[PDB]
Design a protein around this nucleic acid. Structure first.
Ligand code: PAR
Ligand code: PAR
Ligand code: PAR
Ligand code: PAR
Ligand code: PAR
Ligand code: MG
Ligand code: MG
Ligand code: MG
Ligand code: MG
Ligand code: MG
Ligand code: MG
Ligand code: MG
Ligand code: MG
Ligand code: MG
Ligand code: MG
Ligand code: MG
Ligand code: MG
Ligand code: MG
Ligand code: MG
Ligand code: MG
Ligand code: MG
Ligand code: MG
Ligand code: MG
Ligand code: MG
Ligand code: MG
Ligand code: MG
Ligand code: MG
Ligand code: MG
Ligand code: MG
Ligand code: MG
Ligand code: MG
Ligand code: MG
Ligand code: MG
Ligand code: MG
Ligand code: MG
Ligand code: MG
Ligand code: MG
Ligand code: MG
Ligand code: MG
Ligand code: MG
Ligand code: MG
Ligand code: MG
Ligand code: MG
Ligand code: MG
Ligand code: MG
Ligand code: MG
Ligand code: MG
Ligand code: MG
Ligand code: MG
Ligand code: MG
Ligand code: MG
Ligand code: MG
Ligand code: MG
Ligand code: MG
Ligand code: MG
Ligand code: MG
Ligand code: MG
Ligand code: MG
Ligand code: MG
Ligand code: MG
Ligand code: MG
Ligand code: MG
Ligand code: MG
Ligand code: MG
Ligand code: MG
Ligand code: MG
Ligand code: MG
Ligand code: MG
Ligand code: MG
Ligand code: MG
Ligand code: MG
Ligand code: MG
Ligand code: MG
Ligand code: MG
Ligand code: MG
Ligand code: MG
Ligand code: MG
Ligand code: MG
Ligand code: MG
Ligand code: MG
Ligand code: MG
Ligand code: MG
Ligand code: MG
Ligand code: MG
Ligand code: MG
Ligand code: MG
Ligand code: MG
Ligand code: MG
Ligand code: MG
Ligand code: MG
Ligand code: MG
Ligand code: MG
Ligand code: MG
Ligand code: MG
Ligand code: MG
Ligand code: MG
Ligand code: MG
Ligand code: MG
Ligand code: MG
Ligand code: MG
Ligand code: MG
Ligand code: MG
Ligand code: MG
Ligand code: MG
Ligand code: MG
Ligand code: MG
Ligand code: MG
Ligand code: MG
Ligand code: MG
Ligand code: MG
Ligand code: MG
Ligand code: MG
Ligand code: MG
Ligand code: MG
Ligand code: MG
Ligand code: MG
Ligand code: MG
Ligand code: MG
Ligand code: MG
Ligand code: MG
Ligand code: MG
Ligand code: MG
Ligand code: MG
Ligand code: MG
Ligand code: MG
Lengths: 135, 218
RNA sequence: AUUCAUAAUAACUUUUCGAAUCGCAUGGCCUUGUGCUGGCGAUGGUUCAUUCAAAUUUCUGCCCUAUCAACUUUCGAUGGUAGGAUAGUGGCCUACCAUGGUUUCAACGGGUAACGGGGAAUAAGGGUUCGAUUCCGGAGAGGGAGCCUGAGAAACGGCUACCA
RNA sequence: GAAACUGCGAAUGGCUCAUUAAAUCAGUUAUCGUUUAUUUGAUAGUUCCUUACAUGGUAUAACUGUGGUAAUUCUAGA
RNA sequence: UGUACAACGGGGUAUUGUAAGCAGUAGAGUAGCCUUGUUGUUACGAUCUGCUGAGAUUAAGCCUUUGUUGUCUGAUUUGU
RNA sequence: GAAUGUUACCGCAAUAGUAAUUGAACUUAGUACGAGAGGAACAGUUCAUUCGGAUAAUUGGUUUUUGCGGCUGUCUGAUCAGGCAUUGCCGCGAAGCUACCAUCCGCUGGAUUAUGGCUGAACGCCUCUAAGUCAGAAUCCAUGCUAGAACGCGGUGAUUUC
RNA sequence: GCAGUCAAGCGUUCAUAGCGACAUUGCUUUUUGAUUCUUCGAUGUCGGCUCUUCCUAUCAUACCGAAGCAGAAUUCGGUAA
RNA sequence: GUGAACAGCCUCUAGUUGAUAGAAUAAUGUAGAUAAGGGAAGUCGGCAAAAUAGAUCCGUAACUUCGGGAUAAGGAUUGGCUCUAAGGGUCGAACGAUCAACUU
């Protein structure tokens, strides 16, 4: 069973007690007692009726439980592999110190560095394979 | 109802069928983002903690956190908001949305495990799934393996197999925002043409002033 | 024709643009570090002009009707000032102020089996009659209103509401 | 080279004559009263101030996977 | 003479809807008086705000009560 | 309510009164029956109708709770707090009372009627009938319900000292 | 006003399922007359409203019998106020 | 005093406080009130009762003996408080001094 709530006051409406109005636009209104409902019918304003809940929210009455406490956190997580890279496969590449990286560099860095000069005159070489090319 | 459980750590996902009456009601009148406790839901789940991330009521409508309320209200939905996919530019749409507060009308409850507990669920904390991609940028692979700006990346990136009939062809990303000569060449061309257009503009400016000097007198 | 272009000083600013952008090439230098410098392209970007447009706007011109003679001015009707709003002029709106504005040279009102025009039929001349319709302009997407995106919409083979 | 992202278009067309009698419209002016994607033509040495310039930072779609609804060019959450 | 009865008092419950009082750089404003102003003050001012879901009422046919104070042999009538 | 010793408690039950009515839906079943068109019922289920007896958790009504608030006019020098306007007026208003305007409850047998039958003579057959007997109604008598004879009754307790 | 008896006739056939001429025997007293016993030293005169109770010559409802009752509907009847 | 007012309501002066009294608070009355939803279905008939109501602005039909009909009909406003503006008397360019009112 479901406790509903007064559309005017903000009081808890237990089964039974109270009335249910259905406005012509189909918007539903529940009242916990003939008082609230009457106020509503008088077209009163729940923000201006002191004992209503909406009023004392709008006036910041009561409250202070939020000021009294603060709660947070409960988070963390670990890591998992990639298709194409197994965990240890990643644990091996993340691992190495920069000394292995420094050695890895110059071996390839100077590798194509010679392919740069072999290519540099290779256009000059295919420039000697065709220039004017008569007969 | 029907539970939907995520494991962020492993990446595993499995649905759960719990019909147990008084165990369900722990979820009830609790909103999205609130932490449950494990034992109340079932015996095995004891020791765990959940967080309710959403769901669909028995009519399918998605949950949206921030409405409060138990029930479906038709909302006017826009881009960069949940439960809506704006098929056209500037299009907004009135669409029904189930509330954040949990109630018995839900077909599936969405919750992720914030922390584990005593026992362990099969196919959930059992296995762990791979994330199918890896860093496609310069400083991503960099900060992935904890590298520098001179460490390059290249051979540090990921490769995948994909057998083709007999044997294979292995593939790998394009590493955008990589540092190449053509880029520095392009910056050269630019940083230059600035000045090349600068001086020549002041020249033809003074070159004109020769005219207006000798010009008139008339 | 200007309080125009453009320039000057004192400040102002949830400080606009001032290329972390792609494709083809691979050249030239010298202490040779993969240093330094370089080619035509593509996309952008600030203001200005241009173009494609848009918005308003001057003058003059509509059919039947007096068994329609007074009309406009609550609550904008006409004008003045200030402001606000707009892309901008303007009673476009607001505040204050004045009492203006149209009319027998036909207002105002009613009808239209009325979208306007280029044109069409008739073939002495002068005319009578017609134009939904190939072009131009206008309006609309069941009726109304509201709006998002956008350079451009009060859009409907867009959204939102109401009525049907 | 599918998808999806970013881009641009979707305000053109095509239709119809219901409104509309100084309204639209025509011929003729106005913008020294404004807006303008685009297109064409030009326009930029100046950015920090008292620590990347061999180029900062994250965020996400497609995708994969767990899903709800009788049902839609619906969508949730990982 | 009691685990009694009664009157008050207290707690609950309940109705109303925020008391008096004191205070406010809250109040449209108008008028004074002076050192004529970073707050320049003085008077009058519905109303607003704070203490205040406050104050008032609550068995008279509500519930309850370790408190206080009080009371507990008057009249008549009856015999197979 | 006098009196049948007094007083008190628990009971009996003569006699009288008596009470529940009716409808629909689903289902049976698109079945039976019919060429067709059509088109039932018993059993089962859910409700309803008129009636009756209570009852007030709820909802509504009622308001001298003159309980709280609010407003007019006048009066008490002002304040505070009040008086008067035959309850001044308005809003809410517990409690009580109350409503098919609210909720609950409304029994079980025996015996018969018409009628249909058994056995069966009269009348060697036949026949529900003459003797005998089976079934059978919104009926009767009870059960149940109300009152309890103030000249109907049972059990029981205690029965006088200024 | 209500109902009997005879049964020529009706009902395709067929008196009597349902009806029924000519006649004839009755009941009833919510009709109207006939009468003038009661009341003219006074019995309040229409209708309605309200409420109770009785009648049965049954409109419904319970259980039935009959049909010119296939079903459905209807009609006639019994016990029934 | 409130108000248009000798209205109704409260009051000063003045006069009264006189109309058998005590206890209760059944039914039925007499008089005074209020009712959910429906809204004259009640009844000979809306009998009774209820609704309307002051004032300001607005708008006000047929018919007509042109005087009416007319408050026709139909609408809006209404407290409190703090301010503004306009409406005067007398006295010796239009002033000066000076006294006073309430109303819009
Ligand atoms: N129900 C009146 C109608 O009048 C219509 O037309 C009428 C008039 O418009 C027309 O002209 C009349 C004229 O007859 C009469 N004797 C003199 C009068 N001035 C004219 O009147 C006409 O013209 C004048 C200008 O001259 C306008 O001001 C006036 O409004 C217009 N009605 O003559 C007709 C009367 O004879 C048609 N006859 C017809 O539709 C019908 O009769
Ligand atoms: N409730 C259903 C409907 O109402 C009634 O249904 C009733 C019948 O089914 C049955 O009621 C029977 C009745 O059939 C029978 N012919 C008469 C009997 N008196 C009734 O019985 C009733 O009264 C008796 C006491 O007489 C009580 O014991 C019994 O509990 C009571 N239900 O019980 C129902 C409720 O009493 C109507 N008969 C009918 O409209 C329809 O079935
Ligand atoms: N049948 C006994 C049970 O009570 C109910 O049945 C009650 C009634 O429905 C049932 O009614 C029967 C009726 O079916 C049967 N054919 C005839 C019987 N006389 C009726 O019973 C009723 O009849 C009248 C009614 O005023 C009373 O005189 C009689 O005492 C009464 N029992 O009589 C029962 C009461 O005794 C239900 N059928 C059910 O709860 C159960 O079967
Ligand atoms: N209405 C749905 C059903 O149809 C039924 O059907 C009945 C009706 O079609 C028809 O009944 C008629 C009725 O129409 C008419 N208005 C009244 C007439 N006395 C009834 O007659 C019937 O019922 C009565 C009483 O039960 C019996 O005595 C009679 O023999 C019988 N033919 O005959 C059926 C009963 O024999 C009932 N109306 C109803 O109870 C049932 O639920
Ligand atoms: N003219 C109104 C004035 O104020 C009062 O009158 C007002 C109230 O007394 C009167 O109230 C009546 C009530 O008496 C009568 N017996 C019942 C009626 N329903 C009420 O009236 C009100 O009822 C409801 C709101 O409650 C509304 O539906 C209805 O429109 C409204 N008039 O409504 C009147 C307003 O229409 C005084 N009687 C008197 O001062 C004067 O009549
Ligand atoms: Mg109440
Ligand atoms: Mg997000
Ligand atoms: Mg790139
Ligand atoms: Mg000269
Ligand atoms: Mg300038
Ligand atoms: Mg270009
Ligand atoms: Mg004028
Ligand atoms: Mg308007
Ligand atoms: Mg102006
Ligand atoms: Mg201006
Ligand atoms: Mg403007
Ligand atoms: Mg004028
Ligand atoms: Mg037309
Ligand atoms: Mg035309
Ligand atoms: Mg045309
Ligand atoms: Mg011609
Ligand atoms: Mg000609
Ligand atoms: Mg001719
Ligand atoms: Mg046409
Ligand atoms: Mg035409
Ligand atoms: Mg066209
Ligand atoms: Mg159409
Ligand atoms: Mg954009
Ligand atoms: Mg359009
Ligand atoms: Mg279009
Ligand atoms: Mg549109
Ligand atoms: Mg279309
Ligand atoms: Mg077009
Ligand atoms: Mg017109
Ligand atoms: Mg033109
Ligand atoms: Mg971020
Ligand atoms: Mg997301
Ligand atoms: Mg007490
Ligand atoms: Mg207590
Ligand atoms: Mg106070
Ligand atoms: Mg002080
Ligand atoms: Mg102060
Ligand atoms: Mg001050
Ligand atoms: Mg001030
Ligand atoms: Mg000052
Ligand atoms: Mg308070
Ligand atoms: Mg005490
Ligand atoms: Mg004696
Ligand atoms: Mg004895
Ligand atoms: Mg006694
Ligand atoms: Mg007894
Ligand atoms: Mg069926
Ligand atoms: Mg059918
Ligand atoms: Mg068949
Ligand atoms: Mg047949
Ligand atoms: Mg068959
Ligand atoms: Mg049945
Ligand atoms: Mg049955
Ligand atoms: Mg009762
Ligand atoms: Mg009262
Ligand atoms: Mg005093
Ligand atoms: Mg008073
Ligand atoms: Mg007095
Ligand atoms: Mg009075
Ligand atoms: Mg008096
Ligand atoms: Mg009083
Ligand atoms: Mg009340
Ligand atoms: Mg009550
Ligand atoms: Mg019953
Ligand atoms: Mg019942
Ligand atoms: Mg009983
Ligand atoms: Mg019994
Ligand atoms: Mg029996
Ligand atoms: Mg035999
Ligand atoms: Mg027999
Ligand atoms: Mg016998
Ligand atoms: Mg015999
Ligand atoms: Mg027998
Ligand atoms: Mg019975
Ligand atoms: Mg007794
Ligand atoms: Mg006795
Ligand atoms: Mg007797
Ligand atoms: Mg005796
Ligand atoms: Mg004895
Ligand atoms: Mg008779
Ligand atoms: Mg014959
Ligand atoms: Mg025959
Ligand atoms: Mg007669
Ligand atoms: Mg006589
Ligand atoms: Mg006589
Ligand atoms: Mg006599
Ligand atoms: Mg007489
Ligand atoms: Mg007499
Ligand atoms: Mg008499
Ligand atoms: Mg008399
Ligand atoms: Mg008579
Ligand atoms: Mg009989
Ligand atoms: Mg019968
Ligand atoms: Mg009848
Ligand atoms: Mg036959
Ligand atoms: Mg029939
Ligand atoms: Mg019938
Ligand atoms: Mg008959
Ligand atoms: Mg009877
Ligand atoms: Mg006065
Ligand atoms: Mg007076
Ligand atoms: Mg007297
Ligand atoms: Mg008395
Ligand atoms: Mg009385
Ligand atoms: Mg009375
Ligand atoms: Mg009242
Ligand atoms: Mg009523
Ligand atoms: Mg009412
Ligand atoms: Mg009405
Ligand atoms: Mg009437
Ligand atoms: Mg009538
Ligand atoms: Mg009549
Ligand atoms: Mg009257
Ligand atoms: Mg009254
Ligand atoms: Mg007037
Ligand atoms: Mg006239
Ligand atoms: Mg009037
Ligand atoms: Mg009249
Ligand atoms: Mg006011
Ligand atoms: Mg003055």
């Amino acid at each position: 069973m479901k406790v509903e709530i007064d559309s005017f006051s903000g009081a808890k409406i237990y089964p039974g007690r109270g009335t249910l109005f259905v406005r012509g636009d189909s918007k539903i209104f529940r009242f916990q007692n003939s008082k609230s409902a009457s106020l509503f019918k008088q077209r009163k304003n729940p923000r201006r009726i002191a004992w209503t809940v909406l009023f004392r929210k709008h006036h910041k009455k009561g409250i202070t439980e939020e000021v009294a406490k603060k709660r947070s956190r409960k988070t963390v997580k670990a890591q998992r592999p990639i298709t194409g890279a197994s965990l240890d496969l990643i644990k091996e590449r993340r691992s190495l110190k920069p000394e292995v990286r420094k050695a890895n560099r110059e071996e390839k860095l100077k590798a194509n560095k010679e392919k740069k000069k072999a290519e540099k005159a290779a256009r000059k070489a295919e420039k000697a394979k065709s220039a004017g090319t008569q007969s | 109802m029907k539970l939907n459980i995520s494991y962020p750590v492993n990446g595993s996902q499995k649905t759960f069928e719990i019909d147990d009456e008084h165990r369900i009601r722990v979820f009830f009148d609790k909103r999205i983002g609130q932490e449950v406790d494990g034992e109340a839901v079932g015996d095995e789940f004891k020791g765990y903690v959940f967080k309710i991330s959403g769901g669909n009521d028995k009519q399918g409508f998605p949950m949206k956190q921030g409405v409060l309320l138990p029930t479906r209200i038709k909302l006017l939905l826009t881009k960069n908001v949940s439960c809506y996919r704006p098929r056209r530019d500037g299009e907004r749409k009135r669409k029904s949305v189930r509330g954040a507060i949990v109630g018995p009308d839900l077909a599936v409850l969405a919750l992720v495990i914030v922390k584990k507990g005593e026992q362990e669920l099969e196919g959930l904390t059992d296995t762990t799934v791979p994330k199918r991609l890896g860093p496609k940028r310069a400083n991503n692979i960099r900060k992935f393996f904890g590298l520098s700006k001179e460490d390059d990346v290249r051979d540090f990136v990921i490769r995948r197999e994909v057998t083709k009939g007999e044997k294979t062809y292995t593939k790998a990303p394009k590493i955008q925002r990589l540092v190449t000569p053509q880029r520095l060449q392009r910056k050269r061309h630019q940083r230059a043409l600035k000045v090349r257009n600068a001086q020549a503009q002041r020249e033809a400016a003074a070159e004109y002033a020769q005219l207006l000097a000798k010009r008139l007198s008339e």
